[PDB]
């Protein structure tokens, strides 16, 4: 009915009514909890392809209602005319178009509703680039380059999203085939090993299959593979002056820079779907700045990623014959000190996991205060190292699905019928 | 009728059918997940009609486990149970059923990473106990047996079940061996800040506290709903480990030690609708339990700052990761010390690897393995252990270990 959450480190209790506004299933039942499943539910708000009027209109009415409620109208002349406008538009085209204000509101609130995101305290400070007039892969490349340059801002990174045209019938989708705008290639070696980023071996091979000439190194920035109005995707090389990179060095270990490691500065998720009032923006790359652990814990130390732990430990002179020496744990901490020290030295925006999780607790406080709640996914919010010495580990969280939202979608190469 | 879980590190996919046998609530609803909530009346003892199907489900389950389902003995046992429930409004487990139930409450404990050992559990039947002196005796023997001079063995001692709710046996301690905590007038804390409240209850019951940093608390034992009574565990039965560091000479000078035996004593064991309110159980420690939570939680011994200082760490900015660095060294020390003293302990890498092997076997032979990711993933270095990348389904099977209200919140003093 009305659910409370407690922090066990501070005893603060917060009361949640916002969850009553949730629409989509979490995947859980009274009998099974799916909170650690990556993709627990397939409960979509609209059917397969182009929906009928009685399917799309009720979703549209909900979002318009919420937007006009947001700005202290509801029932105002502009609201009631907007409903009639959307109504006639679905009648004559089977879809509708968002005003600039509604589009910005929807993007910002999909970020606000992103239960898995620890960075949401900045949710209302998002730059929205309307790219809905785009018609070709070349135009998409231009929009994406402007996005990257604006968001990088010479190291003082800025949150931004660029929104390409919504889905119509499902055959004219706009898609960025890259999962992130900037990633490193991954190469399947003949001796079975892997050079570069193993996560991207398959996408790297699609690029080569499309004509990309791989330099075959450890940190090869992948090309963009852009799809517009359902046509075959096209390759573009991001101008390197636009790809800001931080060489990784360590403030005490002088031998660290000799590892020859660097990472890119801009994290830009480009494979997700943005859902606003029943409309589906299948290409909506968004970016912010890194939490240190994303690079130094997951990108470098995951077994199926760069996996540098052994090397860093060996250089550190660590006993690697037994787990109980905690050599992995020791190297892991040093790598993350190095990542943070390098980014801060080159004046590139980065946030450590202590600061980020502390900010999120504050964001929670504000949201329960003004909004009646904040959906949060503990399994994702807690950092992947030193969990219990950050304040979120000790914070109970309720998870529920609010719209507008970011959703996953299939990879286009499982879907796309070439020509 | 199927559910699949995937490992995102290995790509292994398992299929859970066992969740169809769950019958009690997770706390989640179809529209909101309560997976991170920690806890989603005395007269609430079960009626005759409530007890009938619970008992049947468990007896059926037990005879299925021993390949005698439907058999003559299964049907007469069923008849025998339903007779007792008619006459007495309760029933009594056979010894075999008690051992099976205690083992399967551990097997079903979704928050326990240590369940690879569930079938090797020593069950001490203390259902004939009637006084707190009797409970003291049972518990001392448990401690001595489980400690085994540092070669720890898992065990549980089961006291008489709940009857009307007015005659409960309880161990008032939360664990069998914990250190006392004392608030000072200046607001500081001596010992373990977790146990300040319980230390005060003991002091008020007559305990004369040494007022030191590592005073083993006395046992506070309640038999048959009477007022609880104090007893001092004989100090020769409490194995302890001084914490030193293999590289840092100065670490021993912190004066740190910990007990060898983790023995949870505040939970309720539920078998076939019967409720065993006093059922202390014990295993051996995973290092991070002591190194991360016990020593470094801000609400606990809180020695991160002290260790970082002796490490010459820059503690001006969080981004130096001085807290992280100090946490690893403490956990190195905890493991080194227990191993040097040949006191059983398990590090989080070994423990989580074993649990993945356990989980896969449980999917093989049982159709699943209920698991609570929020508890199974260790409190440090989470993503470099294999459970972090393992999807898990959480659901509640019985027999089960349950939380219960603290006894001083509900006891009716005589
Ligand atoms: C500005 C600084 C930001 C920080 C520090 C941050 C931090 C994070 C982190 C650490 C994760 C988990 C990633 C992982 O470990 O795999 C995450 C997830 C996510 N972030 Fe943020 N983020 C930021 C900005 C944004 C922005 C601008 C958006 C959208 C406009 C956004 C939307 C999301 C979404 C939708 C997810 C979860 C998606 C999924 O389920 O995979 N974030 N964030
Ligand atoms: C033998 C070695 C064992 C290991 C290494 C082990 C490890 C753990 C750990 C690390 C936890 C989480 C503790 C925390 O962080 O608060 C836990 C929880 C638990 N253990 Fe085990 N354990 C062991 C034995 C046992 C035994 C013998 C039993 C019962 C017979 C048991 C029942 C439980 C239960 C019921 C919980 C969770 C209670 C709850 O909060 O729901 N464990 N275990
Ligand atoms: C194994 N991890 C999965 C990787 C992953 C998958 C997603 F689907 C995300 F959405 C994501 O977001 C990461 C992110 C996004 C932004 C905008 C800023 C920031 N610092 N980090 C990360
Ligand atoms: C600090 N978190 C809360 C503490 C806590 C709460 C519980 F409800 C437990 F059940 C528990 O069990 C800890 C345990 C038990 C056994 C038998 C072995 C072992 N190694 N650890 C610990
Ligand atoms: C709020 C949150 O669920 C709580 O802090 C949990 C998180 N996970 C945990 N995991 C374990 N093993 N032990 C704990 O005490 C906790 N505490
Ligand atoms: C199985 C598990 O759900 C999966 O490995 C999750 C766990 N938590 C995570 N948390 C974050 N931030 N990012 C992730 O990719 C994951 N992966
Ligand atoms: Zn759930």
UniProtKB/Swiss-Prot annotation, chain B:
Q: Which keywords does this chain's UniProt record carry?
A: Calmodulin-binding, Cell membrane, Cell projection, FAD, Flavoprotein, FMN, Heme, Iron, Membrane, Metal-binding, NADP, Oxidoreductase, Phosphoprotein, Synapse, Ubl conjugation
One annotated Gene Ontology cellular component of this protein:
calyx of Held
What's the protein name?
Answer: Nitric oxide synthase 1
What role is this protein assigned?
A: Produces nitric oxide (NO) which is a messenger molecule with diverse functions throughout the body. In the brain and peripheral nervous system, NO displays many properties of a neurotransmitter. Probably has nitrosylase activity and mediates cysteine S-nitrosylation of cytoplasmic target proteins such SRR.
Q: How does it assemble?
A: Homodimer. Interacts with DLG4; the interaction possibly being prevented by the association between NOS1 and CAPON. Forms a ternary complex with CAPON and RASD1. Forms a ternary complex with CAPON and SYN1. Interacts with ZDHHC23. Interacts with NOSIP; which may impair its synaptic location. Interacts with HTR4. Interacts with SLC6A4. Interacts with VAC14. Interacts (via N-terminal domain) with DLG4 (via N-terminal tandem pair of PDZ domains). Interacts with SLC6A4.
- What does the entry list as the binding residues for heme b? 112, 403
Q: Which residues of the full protein are shown?
A: 304 to 722 of 1434
Query: Which species expresses this protein natively?
Result: Homo sapiens
Task: List ligand-binding residues for (6R)-L-erythro-5,6,7,8-tetrahydrobiopterin.
Answer: 36, 374-375, 388
């Amino acid at each position: 009915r009305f659910l409370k959450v407690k922090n066990w480190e501070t005893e603060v209790v917060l009361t949640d009514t916002l969850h009553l506004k949730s629409t989509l299933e979490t995947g859980c039942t009274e009998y099974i909890c799916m909170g650690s499943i990556m993709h627990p539910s397939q409960h979509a708000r609209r059917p397969e392809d182009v929906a009928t009027k009685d399917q799309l209109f009720p979703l549209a009415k909900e979002f318009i209602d919420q937007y006009y409620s947001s700005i202290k109208r509801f029932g105002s002349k502009a609201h009631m005319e907007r409903l009639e406008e959307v109504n006639k538009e679905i009648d004559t085209t089977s879809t509708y178009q968002l005003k600039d204000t509604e589009l910005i509101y929807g993007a910002k609130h999909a970020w606000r509703n992103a239960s898995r995101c620890v960075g949401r305290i900045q949710w209302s400070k998002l730059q929205v680039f309307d790219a809905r007039d785009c018609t070709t892969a070349h135009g998409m490349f231009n929009y994406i380059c402007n996005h990257v340059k604006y968001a990088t801002n010479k190291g003082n990174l800025r949150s931004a999203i660029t929104i390409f045209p919504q889905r119509t019938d499902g055959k004219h989708d706009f898609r960025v085939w890259n999962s992130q705008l900037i990633r490193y290639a991954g190469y399947k070696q003949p001796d079975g090993s892997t050079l570069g980023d193993p996560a991207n071996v398959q996408f790297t091979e699609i690029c080569i299959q499309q004509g990309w000439k791989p330099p075959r190194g450890r940190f090869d920035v992948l090309p963009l593979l852009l799809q517009a109005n359902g046509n075959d995707p096209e390759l573009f090389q991001i101008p390197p002056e636009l790809v800001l990179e931080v060489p990784i060095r360590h403030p005490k270990f002088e031998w660290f820079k000799d590892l020859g490691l660097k990472w890119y500065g801009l994290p830009a998720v480009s494979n997700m779907l943005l859902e606003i009032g029943g409309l589906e923006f299948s290409a909506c790359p968004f970016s912010g700045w890194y939490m240190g652990t994303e690079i130094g814990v997951r990108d470098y130390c995951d077994n199926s990623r760069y996996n540098i732990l052994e090397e860093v430990a060996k250089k550190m002179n660590l006993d690697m014959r037994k787990t109980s020496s905690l050599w992995k744990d020791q190297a892991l901490v040093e790598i993350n000190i190095a990542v943070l020290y390098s980014f801060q030295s080159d004046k590139v925006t980065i946030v450590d996991h202590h600061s980020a999780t502390e900010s999120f607790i504050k964001h929670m406080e504000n949201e329960y205060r003004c909004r009646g709640g904040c959906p949060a996914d503990w399994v994702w919010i807690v950092p992947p190292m030193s969990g219990s010495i950050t304040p979120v580990f000790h914070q109970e969280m309720l998870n529920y699905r609010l719209t507008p939202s970011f959703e996953y979608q299939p990879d286009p190469w499982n879907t796309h019928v070439w020509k």
